[PDB]
């Protein structure tokens, strides 16, 4: 009948086993060859450990020389959470345009939850090497050690590469800028505002080359959310304890609007919170007539269950163009990268034992 | 094995040998109603069926039940579990049969594409010597520390 050696479902391509070398990932000038890298990672291809570390460290060196608060001019396509959904990241660049001719800004949460986080890091770091002054990456609350060891990035790295590659990602993440000032109008962060941050200068004075502390302004940038009832304030408090996160704070519509007014800003662009449409426009500020807060979320069908759209903000020609997209197929992993023997063997022992017991009564 | 255990096994064998042919066919196993809803029935029969004639004789039935003995060592229990996957009986779990044996157990709880993908990945992360297949050594290295041998004991 069906072969016992040859693969049953031959329409599925067998993933490549060869690990790409330096010569194959970097061209004659040392520029990453992103087409090779994309094609190879789309097939679940892996790199040699030394090449992976080169991408991470060379990207880190570029990030290490950028400011806490980037100055990014328009036009630019702003993007929210990715959470290891590499194949939606492929779709994302289709929707927003190739980075060869498109300025990009990412607000963090590249890893965890999705099971292609290391591919997201490697490809985005390779783009950052190739386009150091037109593709920008900020830190999210997940680009740290506390979360990657609790969720799945650390395990993913140990499964596909090594803890050394993981450690290298952690040192690289410590270099990620925290915020961007976009076209002199928008503060861009992963999470939001801090009680201890009242000026743009307060972000500039921070020391970011560290694990995120458990409290403080750096924590707050990566962790804060708008109030559940943002804009319908019976609450009077500008900042209150964020009981969803267990740390940092909720910030209110008066809090956001005062910050915008003090610092001469149009809106706050952030991410950090899933949205059914991939974005949310919050109540306009009464002095700007413009949404005080914008959440952008770029991980469609989040966790393979939310069934949400994802979106990016293309800001260009004084138009804020929301571009939505749907999820794309992605190869399957068992939860926590479990192999099929570990998965099924307890069921084998169970059912052969059950059969034998029934055979014998 | 133990004498009295042999007497009892001869009686059950006869009860199951519906056409009194001296050998147990697949049909005769499937007559047991419990076995009807068990997806590994055919795999256990094939392992028991060492001479390959498609049925289980008494020698085969005794040798088969003995591997699940309390005195049996881990390597024996795991060697049995290994043969559940090793359809073609060649000592190595190959891609085609790993998929087939898993499809028997999962049924429709996974699509053929998702199962082929996680099967590919296991073949790849586990094949150390690089011959495209999973030996018993490679197999033990993955599942070894799971204490599955403890659940594979029958009182005859």
């Amino acid at each position: 009948k069906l072969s016992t050696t040859d693969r049953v479902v031959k329409a599925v391509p067998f993933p490549p086993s060869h690990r790409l070398t330096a010569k194959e990932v970097f061209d004659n000038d040392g520029k990453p060859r992103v087409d090779i890298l994309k094609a190879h990672l789309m097939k679940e291809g892996r790199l040699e450990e030394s090449v992976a570390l080169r991408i991470i460290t060379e990207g880190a060196s570029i990030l290490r020389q950028e400011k806490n608060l980037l100055d990014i001019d328009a036009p630019v396509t702003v993007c929210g959470d990715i959470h290891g959904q590499f194949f939606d990241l492929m779709k994302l660049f289709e929707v927003g345009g190739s980075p060869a001719n498109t300025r990009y800004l990412f607000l963090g949460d590249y890893v965890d939850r999705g099971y292609f986080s290391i591919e997201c890091v490697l490809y985005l770091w390779a783009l950052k090497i190739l386009y150091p002054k037109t593709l920008f990456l900020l830190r999210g609350n997940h680009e740290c050690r506390a979360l990657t060891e609790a969720f799945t990035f650390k395990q993913e790295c140990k499964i596909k590469y090594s803890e050394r590659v993981y450690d290298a990602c952690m040192d690289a993440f410590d270099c990620l800028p925290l915020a961007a000032l976009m076209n002199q109008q928008f503060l861009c962060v992963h999470g939001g505002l801090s009680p201890e941050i009242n000026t743009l200068d307060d972000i500039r004075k921070l020391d970011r080359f560290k694990e995120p502390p458990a409290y403080g302004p750096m924590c707050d940038i990566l962790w804060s959310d708008p109030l559940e009832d943002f804009g319908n304030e019976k609450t009077q408090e500008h900042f209150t304890h964020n009981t969803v996160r267990g740390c940092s704070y909720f910030y209110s519509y008066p809090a956001v609007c005062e910050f915008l007014q003090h610092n001469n800003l149009l809106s706050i662009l952030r991410a950090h919170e899933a949205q059914d449409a991939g974005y949310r426009m919050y109540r306009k500020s009464q002095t700007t007539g413009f949404p005080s807060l914008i959440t952008i979320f770029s991980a469609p069908n989040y966790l393979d269950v939310y069934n949400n759209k994802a979106a990016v903000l293309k800001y260009e020609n004084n138009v804020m163009n929301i571009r939505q997209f749907n999820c794309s197929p992605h190869p399957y992993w068992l939860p926590n990268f479990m192999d099929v023997f570990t998965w099924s063997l307890p069921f084998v022992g169970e059912k052969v034992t059950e059969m034998l017991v029934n055979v014998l009564n | 094995m133990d004498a009295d255990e042999i007497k009892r096994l001869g009686k059950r064998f006869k009860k199951l040998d519906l056409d009194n042919s001296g050998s147990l066919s697949v049909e005769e196993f499937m007559s047991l109603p419990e076995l009807q809803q068990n997806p590994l029935v055919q795999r256990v029969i094939d392992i028991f069926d060492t001479d390959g004639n498609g049925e289980v004789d008494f020698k085969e039935f005794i040798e088969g039940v003995s591997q699940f003995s309390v005195k049996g060592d881990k390597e024996q229990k795991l060697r049995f579990a290994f043969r559940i996957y090793d359809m073609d009986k060649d000592g190595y779990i190959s891609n085609g049969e790993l998929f087939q044996v898993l499809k028997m157990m999962v049924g429709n709880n996974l699509k053929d594409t998702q199962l082929q993908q996680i099967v590919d990945k296991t073949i790849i992360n586990a094949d150390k010597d690089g011959d495209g297949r999973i030996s018993f050594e490679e197999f033990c290295a993955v599942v070894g520390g799971l204490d599955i041998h403890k659940k594979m004991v029958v009182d005859v």
Binding site: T288, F290, N321, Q324, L334, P335 | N109
Partner: peptide, 18 residues
């Protein structure tokens, strides 16, 4: 009976999913 998986002002425009 079967194995289971472990359980001045800018305009704002929209391009819906393709």
């Amino acid at each position: 009976n079967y194995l289971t998986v472990p359980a001045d002002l800018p305009v704002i425009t929209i391009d819906p999913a393709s």
